[PDB]
């Protein structure tokens, strides 16, 4: 019965920013990771 219970929300525009961010970083950095 913790009164400090919260929920996380993530709308689809934040999904589209998040998925883009980890693919663009994978487009960027993996050229260096595969070297």
């Amino acid at each position: 019965p913790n009164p400090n219970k919260q929920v996380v929300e993530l709308n689809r525009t934040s999904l589209y920013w998040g998925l883009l961010l980890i693919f663009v970083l994978a487009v960027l950095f993996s050229s260096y990771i595969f070297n």
Partner: peptide, 30 residues
């Protein structure tokens, strides 16, 4: 082509991809 970079690429995709999918499908059902 190394064992590190081929699976570090796959972990940097899928561990944050699915984390965001866990939070979105949680939210889109509310």
């Amino acid at each position: 082509v190394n064992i590190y970079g081929l699976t570090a690429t796959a972990l940097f995709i899928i561990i944050p991809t699915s984390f965001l999918l866990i939070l979105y499908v949680k939210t889109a059902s509310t």
